[PDB]
């Protein structure tokens, strides 16, 4: 069921300090090697008025 390289995709919906946003993302990683990379796109509420960094551990 897992594989040495796997893709993933994300949807994120949120409010931060009253500002609504939505993102989608797509990435891929090596689960057993512990590395991954993705692209995150803000599809609603962009450009974000807050630092993306607060979303890093969620995306």
């Amino acid at each position: 069921f897992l594989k040495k390289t796997m893709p993933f995709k994300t949807t994120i919906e949120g409010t931060v300090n009253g500002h609504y946003f939505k993102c989608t993302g797509k990435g891929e990683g090596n689960p057993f090697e512990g590395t991954q990379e993705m692209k995150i796109e803000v599809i609603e509420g962009g450009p974000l008025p807050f630092a993306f960094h607060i979303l890093s551990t969620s995306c």
């Binding site: 069921f1 897992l2 594989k3 796997m6 893709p7 993933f8 995709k9 994300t10 949807t11 994120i12 919906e13 949120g14 409010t15 931060v16 300090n17 993302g25 990435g27 990683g29 090596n30 689960p31 057993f32 090697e33 512990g34 590395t35 991954q36 990379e37 993705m38 692209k39 995150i40 796109e41 803000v42 962009g46 450009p47 974000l48 008025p49 807050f50 630092a51 993306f52 960094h53 607060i54 979303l55 890093s56 551990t57 969620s58 995306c59």
Partner: protein
């Protein structure tokens, strides 16, 4: 995105063991300057694709702080403690933003990880550490590329004299 972790020293992998059912996680991050970032996430496996659904509520970020001024810089690496509580996993960690200029803004992460398997079905890991490095590889307010590397381990660097992990 906890499926992507290199575990050493035989530590059981709570996340990989959770498939094909998957798992959730929930977290509140408390920033030292008053901000809070709370999230709930569902992780599922749809064929060959990991699927993440995330809900976010952030609040109380000061208008004059790095977050709302969009001058947050970059995250330093960090280390999470991960351990069993009741029958699920708790995590806690400290993270630090290195603001442009070189100064740091810290926060505290409080997490629960919940397998969708019964913990009777799971090999639970003992107390251990999860090192991470998150990097914003490209700011392509609207399009970001982000990298993470993570390692699950014991404290190899300072060994026990008493037989402990």
């Amino acid at each position: 995105s906890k499926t992507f972790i290199k575990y050493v020293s035989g530590i059981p992998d709570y996340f990989k063991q959770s498939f094909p059912e998957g798992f959730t996680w929930e977290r509140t991050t408390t920033y030292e300057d008053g901000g809070f970032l709370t999230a709930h996430q569902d992780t599922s496996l749809d064929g060959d694709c990991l699927v993440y659904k995330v809900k976010i509520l952030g609040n109380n970020f000061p208008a004059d702080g790095p977050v709302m001024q969009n001058k947050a810089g970059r995250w330093e690496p960090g280390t999470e403690i991960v351990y069993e509580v009741d029958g699920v996993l708790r995590g806690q960690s400290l993270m630090a933003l290195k603001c442009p200029g070189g100064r740091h803004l810290t926060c505290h992460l409080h997490t629960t990880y919940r397998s969708k398997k019964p913990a009777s079905a799971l090999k639970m890991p003992g107390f251990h550490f999860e090192d991470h490095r998150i990097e914003i590889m490209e700011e392509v307010g609207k399009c970001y590329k982000q990298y993470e590397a993570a390692v699950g381990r014991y404290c190899d660097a300072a060994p026990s004299k008493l037989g402990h992990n």
